[PDB]
Amino acid sequence: VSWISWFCGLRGNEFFCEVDEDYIQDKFNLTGLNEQVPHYRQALDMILDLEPDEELEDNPNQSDLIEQAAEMLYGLIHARYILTNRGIAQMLEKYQQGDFGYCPRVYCENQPMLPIGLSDIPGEAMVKLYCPKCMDVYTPKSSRHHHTDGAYFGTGFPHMLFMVHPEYRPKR
Amino acid sequence: EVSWISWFCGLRGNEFFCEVDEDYIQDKFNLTGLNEQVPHYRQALDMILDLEPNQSDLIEQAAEMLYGLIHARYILTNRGIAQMLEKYQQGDFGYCPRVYCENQPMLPIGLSDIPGEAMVKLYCPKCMDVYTPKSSRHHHTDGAYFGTGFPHMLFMVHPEYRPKR
Numbered sequence: 447v448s449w450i451s452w453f454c455g456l457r458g459n460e461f462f463c464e465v466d467e468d469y470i471q472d473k474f475n476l477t478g479l480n481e482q483v484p485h486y487r488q489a490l491d492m493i494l495d496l497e498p499d500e501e502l503e504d505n506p507n508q509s510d511l512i513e514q515a516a517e518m519l520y521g522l523i524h525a526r527y528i529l530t531n532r533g534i535a536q537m538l539e540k541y542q543q544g545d546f547g548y549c550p551r552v553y554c555e556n557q558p559m560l561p562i563g564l565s566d567i568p569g570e571a572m573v574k575l576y577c578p579k580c581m582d583v584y585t586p587k588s589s590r591h592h593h594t595d596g597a598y599f600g601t602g603f604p605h606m607l608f609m610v611h612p613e614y615r616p617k618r
Numbered sequence: 619e620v621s622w623i624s625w626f627c628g629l630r631g632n633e634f635f636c637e638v639d640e641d642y643i644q645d646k647f648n649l650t651g652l653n654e655q656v657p658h659y660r661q662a663l664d665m666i667l668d669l670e671p672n673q674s675d676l677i678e679q680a681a682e683m684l685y686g687l688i689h690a691r692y693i694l695t696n697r698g699i700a701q702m703l704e705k706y707q708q709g710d711f712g713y714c715p716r717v718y719c720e721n722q723p724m725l726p727i728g729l730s731d732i733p734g735e736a737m738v739k740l741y742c743p744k745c746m747d748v749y750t751p752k753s754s755r756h757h758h759t760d761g762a763y764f765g766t767g768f769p770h771m772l773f774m775v776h777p778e779y780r781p782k783r
């Protein structure tokens with residue numbers, strides 16, 4: 447399985463959706479990201495499953511540092527991706543599956559929530575959950591999601607989704 | 619040798635309960651009215667107080683219901699409230715999930731005082747709303763064992779713990 451499929455499958459990455467390879471392959475979609483993550487070249491290669499460099503001698507491995515970079519880069523791409531009609535389509539799918547959890551308010555009656563970020567700057571805050579019914583923001587019940595940066599989901603995702611799919615917005 | 623009460627409050631899922639003072643239970647005046655709500659009231663009250671005892675499990679079930687009803691009244695008394703306030707300070711009931719409530723500890727609360735109506739819920743004193751416990755281990759604890767007015771009783775007796783919202 448692809449790096450992306452492998453990543454989105456890990457424990458804690460349930461909120462993520464699989465970004466279409468072609469979206470990533472189009473340089474125009476990643477403009478600006480390459481200057482936010484270290485080892486951008488090797489990291490983007492790892493995400494797309496390509497020959498992982500030469501790698502010769504004592505040359506300290508710095509391997510893990512690249513794995514982390516791929517992780518950050520995938521996140522930033524994810525953020526942009528889920529604003530596009532295709533990404534939104536995929537998230538809407540998970541939404542229908544309750545992939546993001548249900549609102550804990552007793553009166554929201556288990557309204558499924560959408561992931562959301564309190565900030566678009568990486569390292570600011572971890573991902574939170576937005577209930578479209580009571581329109582408030584909650585902390586995920588599972589600690590497994592307490593290390594997922596919210597910037598990988600953005601502050602305007604939930605808004606975008608309902609803008610494109612008004613029919614799913616809770617009534618009254 | 620652990621007392622029935624100590625044993626009960628120690629079971630998985632009964633973390634929201636506090637241990638009712640034996641003497642409170644021994645005073646007949648405090649239980650007036652309860653004896654006509656649970657079956658086998660005599661044997662059940664005996665089991666709760668650790669006294670000389672197929673219909674067995676049915677009595678264990680009765681002691682469980684009876685302890686709950688007593689708990690409900692108990693936590694309205696200054697002594698019960700004191701104990702609950704303790705657990706409250708330990709975050710024994712959990713913290714509010716609202717991101718902006720900033721992990722405000724919550725108090726248990728019932729949506730109804732009638733047994734069998736609804737399971738126990740959590741009241742955040744900051745956003746003043748009611749939530750369902752994150753852990754499924756608490757999804758079988760009747761809310762009637764905590765009452766609809768407990769949280770409000772606690773803060774009337776301890777206004778100083780009223781969060782600045």
Ligand SMILES: [Zn+2]
Pocket residue numbers: 549550551554557577578579580581582
């Ligand atoms: Zn809600």
Ligand SMILES: [Zn+2]
Pocket residue numbers: 714715716719722742743744745746747
């Ligand atoms: Zn709250």
